[PDB]
Every structure is written in C-alpha cells, then in structure tokens.
C-alpha cells in the first residue's frame, strides 16, 4: 500500500493527518503494509517551489498506487498567472494520470436525515454514487465558436469514451448494490441514443449487475422524489456535472463529501470542501470528508471493500456521538478522529 | 375576450368546463366580454374527422386571442401513423402559432407544504416561473449525426432566439416580483457566454426588473436548497427542460400544474397532466390545473393580473377546505369548482 499524500493548503494538513491516523490504525490491526510519503502540492508548493506540482511530487504520484489529497488554494494565490495557480496544479495532476471518471457519493447517514433539505422519510437511506465522464462532451467538443450573431458548442462522444467510463460504473457497482443507472437524452439526441446503445453492449460483460437507463430530465425529478432507490449512476460530462451538484445537496452539509477520480494512472481521493484558511491551525476542522476519502481509497484503489465499510461505519457513529461544530457540536478535529478510532478498534 | 376551447380527450371535457365555470363567473362579476367557442382536437378529432387538428379548429385558434386546452391522447390512439397522432396535433398547434417560450410555474400553496418532498421550512413560499426556450438549442441543432464510432449534437443559438425568449421573461417578471434569473453555462461554454451577454443587453430596456445570472449546475442545487428565493427563471431548451421537471416536483402533486406557451401567434394554456381515461365521466377529476391555466390566461394573454391572482387565491383555499381525492379528500369535480366559485364571489 504505497500512498502519496498531498496535504495541500489551509486545513489540508490537519484533515489529511486525521485520515492518516485512521489508515495507520488499520495497518496495525489488519496488517495492511501501508507505505506513504507526503509531497508539496498547491499553494504550499508554489511558495516553497514556485509551482503547484513540482517534479518530486509528479514523480511521487507516478510511483504510488494512490494519491490522498488534502484541500488546495486560497486568496493568497488568487492573483498569479494560470500557468502556476493551485487550480492549474489540480488540472495537471488529473491529466498526468489520465483520469477519465469522477466518482461522487451522496449518502444520508442514519440519524443525520435532519440535515437534509428533504423530508426525513425521503432522505432516509440515500446512498448514491454518481460516476461522471470527465474528458469528453460539450465541455471539450469541437466545433465551438461565438459570433456577434450566434454561438455553437458540440456535444460529441466516441465509443471508447463511453466504454471506459461505463466500465468504471460496472466495476464500482459490483462492490456496492450491483445496480447501475445510465443517464442519457436518447429520446431526442443522437448522442443520447449512441451512449445508450454502447452501455448496453458493454453491459453484456457484467451479467452480475442490473442495468437501467433514464433521461436526465427524468433523473433530476427522481433524485428529489426518491433518491433512495439508486446505487450507481453513470452519465456524460455535463449531465454528470448537473447530477452530482444536485445529489450533493441531499445530505445537507457539503462538508461531509469525499470524491475520487479514476482512470489509467494513479487514482486520486480528495475531499470536496475547500481550504477554509480562516480555520487553519485552530483544531476544529471536520475531517469527515478526508476520512471518507481514505475509505474511498481502500475500496476503489485497493479493493479493500470490507475495510472501507468498516471506516464508513465508524464515521457514521462518530457523527452521532461527537458531532463536529459544523454539525452543531463541539468535537474538534482530534476529538472527532479519536471517536472514529474508538469504533475502529 | 375571444377564447378557443379545445377540450381534448379523457378528462379534458370535464376539467375544461370547470375552468369555463370560473371564466363565466368572472365575466358576469367583472363584465369581461368573454366570447368562446369549443373545437374538436386530439383523439376526439381523429375520430370525428380523421385528424387531430382539423381546419375548423386551426381557423378557430387563429381567429382567437387565447386557446384553453384540455388534455389530449390515450391508448385508443397509441397506434397510428405519426402523421395523425394526437401528439402530432399538439406539435402542429404550437408550430402554427410560432410559440417560442414555454412557461411553467411551480408553487407551494400555503398549507399544502406537506405534499412537498422538501422539508416544510424550505417548501414554504415556493412560487417560481420557469421560462424555457422551445425552438432552438441542441434539440434542433445541426450538425447532428451518429456513426458506429461516434455521435454528435450541436447546441447553437442566434441572438434573435435568445432575445425573444428573454423578452418574455422580463414581461412575465413585471407582472410578478420583477426578479429574473437567467441560467447559462457561461464559465465553460461559448454558447453560455453568448446567452449571458445578450440577456444583459436586452435587460437594459427593463430598468424596473432586477436581472441575475446562474450556472445550470448551481441552479439545480438552489431549486432544492432554497427554491423560495426565485421568481422568474429563463434558460435554453435543454436546461429549461431539466429545470422545469426538477421544479415540477417541488409542490409534490404533478396534477396541480398549469402551463403556457407564448410566442407570435395565439397563446396556449393547458394543464400539465394527462387524459386519465379511466376517470372520464366519473366526476372526480381534479380541475385545479385547468382552473390555474384559465388564470394563466387572464395574466399572460389578457394582462388581467388582478383577476388571475383572485382565481389563484380561490383555488388555494378550495384545496384546503374541500381537497379533491388526488389530495386525500372527497370533493369531486363539481364540488371543488363550487368551492372555488364561493371564494370567487
């Protein structure tokens, strides 16, 4: 288990270490063979090195089996060439590993249904994984243009593009509830139709997973009306972008969410939340997303499903007994971790 | 006030007449000058005439100032050439009047917040009008295509296309809360950027209305988290399609929703719900959407804002005191109307 840790800025260092606390606990208990190294990245790298993703790091990530990322950026670096901004470093990391799928879970922890914008009856049991295609679609599609009279943008997809992302959805599903929902716009768009036909074909290779298809428009209504019925959801770049933001509001605290990006290279696990520089060094940062990313790591990069679920379990309980401030509570960073560990051992 | 009534199929005839009951009540009270004629349309037209939109009707709609539509279609006609299917008649109606904007309100009636999938605190006070562009975008965009290797679809927009729909949003807003939100994908797409720049330009002509812009992805999160802060929302075809389905689930009963389509020709007002043939002639059909379309008609086609609000008010109360079966109640069609009239006079 060779992990590259890129603590990042602001609260990165503190929340990341909390994850490490957890990984370290499991290595000891389960004899996992954990081997990790921390590398400069983000604001910290620009400052110590003049650039966000220095060669030692790049080499660091390439020689590892997983990257655990903290948070990156802040006001301190809002005014530099894009050539060397924290965000560009993130962008480069992702490209260097040719990461084509973005994984984003949305789950309502038993007893935390109160923070959801939805009624409790509906919020209860939500546990959805949105798999978004990250390299193709309209966002990158050519021809693109603007006039004084019109503007155009092309939504285009290749069989191989659809194929790869679909493959990650099926593999993701087998480790979960083995139920996949592909989202297209088949009734109206050629692209939609092509996407549907390809996922159906790929699907033949995974008899152990149920496959269903839905219109993005229908899917939007369903993520509100009965989000508890989905497992894995896969779709294009723009639709996945919309559907993950939507789903991200279900649990009611955009601070509890981890995120993973898979592809050909070393996989990246990272909390969805920001840097929150105001809080750096105070203790108090909620390590929940960092821990949940550590857990994403065990499952998706190491296939250690059993453990990932163990950890998820621990945080679920930690959240109830010693909820952090962000959840109307007082447990600071260390306090919270401690309680997670307690349900670990 | 020359209205063309196209009762349609199934429960159309019954719910439409209930609206008429209401219009008739107001004409008497307010001396409105109402003059309407009922014309064959849908399943009924195919059967009596061999086609869904016979010339007497077409001529009917063209010589009127507003079209009040009931519901159209059913199993009875699910198997005919598309040349003459009910749905094609709808499609033709809309094209013959060159209707470019689709208006769809989503409101949570005081005290009906219980039917919303959202928590009451959040559901309370929702009253949003989604204005969707209906003729352009990706749905109609060329070049389009499919291969065995790839598929493409173009999202394209002309200044004049954006201009017209924006104009209907500003005009719609002045009659409401004078607050418009334009939704684009400006940060990533040329099209997005072009749409934003044009709505901002058009906007200069309406100093009396506040204009704000949002990313569709952000908007999706907002329609769940705090839908009560919007008034009028305007966007492209696909985004408007997604955003209206999303918003349609807020009130928790897809049977209470009216809909309007505006453009160059005679405007069309119609309930969102289906035919529900199982119920035809039993009484029991919920006329709420038909009445709310009648009200949409007063506001949008006749500028009778004051009245539309009077009617809306009446139905709000009817819903509470004599809720129809669909809302766990017993008031049938006539019963419900009667109670609406009561709060009318």
Swiss-Prot record, chains A, B:
Entry's EC annotation: 1.1.1.85
Domain of life: Bacteria
Gene Ontology terms, MF aspect: 3-isopropylmalate dehydrogenase activity; identical protein binding; magnesium ion binding; NAD binding
Ligand binding (NAD(+)): 74-87, 274-286
Keywords of the record: Amino-acid biosynthesis, Branched-chain amino acid biosynthesis, Cytoplasm, Leucine biosynthesis, Magnesium, Manganese, Metal-binding, NAD, Oxidoreductase
Gene3D superfamilies to which the protein is assigned, alphabetical: Isopropylmalate Dehydrogenase (3.40.718.10)
Residues noted as binding substrate in the record, renumbered to the chain: 94, 104, 132, 217
Cofactors demanded by this protein: Mg(2+); Mn(2+)
Family annotation (InterPro entries): IsoCit/isopropylmalate_DH_CS, IsoPropMal-DH-like_dom, Isopropylmalate_DH
Pfam families for the chain: Iso_dh
Main localization category: cytoplasm
Annotated residues for binding of Mg(2+): 217, 241, 245
Cofactor descriptive note: Binds 1 Mg(2+) or Mn(2+) ion per subunit.
GO cellular component terms given for this protein: cytosol
A Gene Ontology biological process term: L-leucine biosynthetic process
Annotated localization: Cytoplasm
Pathway: Amino-acid biosynthesis; L-leucine biosynthesis; L-leucine from 3-methyl-2-oxobutanoate: step 3/4
Site positions (Important for catalysis): 139, 185
Catalysed reaction equations from the record: (2R,3S)-3-isopropylmalate + NAD(+) = 4-methyl-2-oxopentanoate + CO2 + NADH
Record function comment: Catalyzes the oxidation of 3-carboxy-2-hydroxy-4-methylpentanoate (3-isopropylmalate) to 3-carboxy-4-methyl-2-oxopentanoate. The product decarboxylates to 4-methyl-2 oxopentanoate.
Subunit structure: Homodimer.
PANTHER family linked: 3-ISOPROPYLMALATE DEHYDROGENASE
HAMAP family: LeuB_type1
Family in the record: Belongs to the isocitrate and isopropylmalate dehydrogenases family. LeuB type 1 subfamily.
Designated name of the protein: 3-isopropylmalate dehydrogenase
Record organism: Thermus thermophilus (strain ATCC 27634 / DSM 579 / HB8)
Phylogenetic lineage: Bacteria, Thermotogati, Deinococcota, Deinococci, Thermales
